[PDB]
Amino acid sequence: GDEVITQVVAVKNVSVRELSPLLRQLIDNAGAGNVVHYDPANIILITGRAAVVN
Amino acid sequence: ITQVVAVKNVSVRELSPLLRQLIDNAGAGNVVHYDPANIILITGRAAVVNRLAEIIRRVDQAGDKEIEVVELNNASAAEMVRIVEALNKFVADERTNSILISGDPKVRERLKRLIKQLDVEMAAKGNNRVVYLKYA
Amino acid sequence: KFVADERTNSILISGDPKVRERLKRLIKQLDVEMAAKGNNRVVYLKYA
């Protein structure tokens, strides 16, 4: 559905800052309210609509 | 009310912009102050102080890292050391002959995996042999 | 990248499951042991 939830998922292989521009492309591709925050401890944060967060 | 909660894993100054986002997202009166002794201060409405403490504890609980101590009965610890050293943290003691670990409960999963991986002891090779001469 | 132990005499690997495919290939490739060459020989002198 359209709900706003945060999802925490990992990419171990290389630091996920590498995805900041294209992920903010999906933060741009649709409506905002999102965050995608890349923890240097290497996990992954999204917040926003479950579809675009997907 | 003010809430004092910890993030041990890395210094919480790292959260100042996004936490002030929740100091911006709603009304002010808040403080979030990051003590270099590594604890955490919020002050403000219990709801926004909560979501703040949830981001905060979301960098607390996130990256967990500590030490393990696990017996190495067979493969020399210092060897375990060396043979992990090539991998790119780790301790062991050869008083005990035990891998110690510093890092993740993912490091705890995979490095209990490598606790187990090189524990094995090679079968005797008959390196030396006593031969009974029949004639000579 | 690559490791091994000669306690165990075992290749350890760091890298891909493509590195796992090809480097199980090279796990297997140089496992072979050369046949004995009769490097030394005891010769029975008939006369001298």
Long-range pairs, B109-112, Cβ under 8 A, ≥24? B111/B68, B112/B68, B112/B70
* The two three-digit tokens of residue B77, written as one number: 């610890």
Reference C5, options B124, B86, B115; nearest CA is B86
Fold of A1-54: Ribosomal Protein S8; Chain: A, domain 1 (3.30.1370)
d(CA A53, CA B17): 22
Experimental method: cryo-EM
B6 Cβ contact partners less than 8 Å away, ≥ 6 residues apart: B38, B39, B40, B60
* The two three-digit tokens of residue B58, written as one number: 């979301």
Q: Do B65-122 and B1-64 fall under one CATH topology?
A: yes
Note whether A43 contacts B63, CB cutoff 8 Å: yes
d(CA B120, CA C19): 24
Minimal-distance CA residue of chain A relative to B63: A41
The answer, for A43 touching chain B at a CB cutoff of 8 Å, is yes
Q: Which of A35, A39, A42 sits opposite B59 (nearest CB)?
A: A39
Residue A19 DSSP one-character state: G
* The two three-digit tokens of residue B45, written as one number: 């409405």
- B37 φ/ψ sector (left φ>0, alpha ψ -120 to 50, else beta): alpha
Burial A2-11 (b: 16+ CB within 10 A, else e): eeeebeeeee
- Chain A residues inside the 8 Å CB shell of B63: 39, 41-43
What residues does A44 pair with on adjacent strands?
A9, A38
Cβ atoms of B65 and B107 within 8 Å: the answer is yes
Cβ atoms of A48 and A33 within 8 Å: the answer is yes
Reference B3, options B32, B37, B23, B36; nearest CA is B32
Q: What is the CATH number of domain B65-122?
A: 3.30.1370.120
Q: Residue A13 burial by CB count (10 A; 0-12/13-18/19+): exposed, middle or buried? A: exposed
Note whether C5 contacts B87, CB cutoff 8 Å: no
Task: Find how far residue B95's CA is from the centre of its chain.
Answer: 23
Cβ atoms of B98 and B92 within 8 Å: the answer is yes
Note whether B10 contacts A43, CB cutoff 8 Å: no
Position C19, amino acid: V
Closest CA–CA distance from residue A6 to any residue of chain B (Å): 11
Task: Find how far residue B125's CA is from the centre of its chain.
Answer: 39
- Chain A residues inside the 8 Å CB shell of B14: 40
C48 Cβ contact partners less than 8 Å away, ≥ 6 residues apart: none
What residues does B70 pair with on adjacent strands?
B99
Per-domain boundaries in chain A: 1-54
Helices vs. strands in chain C: H and E counts, helices first: 1, 2
- Chain C residues inside the 8 Å CB shell of B120: 8
Q: Which chains touch C (3 or more CB pairs under 8 A)?
A: B
Query: In 10 A of CB B42, how many CB atoms?
Result: 25
- Chain C residues inside the 8 Å CB shell of B118: 5, 7-8
Closest CA–CA distance from residue B120 to any residue of chain C (Å): 8
- Chain A residues inside the 8 Å CB shell of B59: 39, 41
Q: Which of C3, C7, C12 sits opposite B122 (nearest CB)?
A: C7
Asked if CATH classification 3.30.1370.120 holds for the domain at B1-64, the reply, yes or no, is yes
Q: DSSP string spanning B35-60?
A: ETTTEEEEES-HHHHHHHHHHHHHHH
Note whether B18 contacts A40, CB cutoff 8 Å: no
Reference B28, options B45, B50, B53; nearest CA is B45
Q: How far is CA B93 from CA B7, B73, B77, B86, C4, in A?
A: 29, 11, 6, 18, 22
d(CA B15, CA A44): 15
- Chain A residues inside the 8 Å CB shell of B9: 41
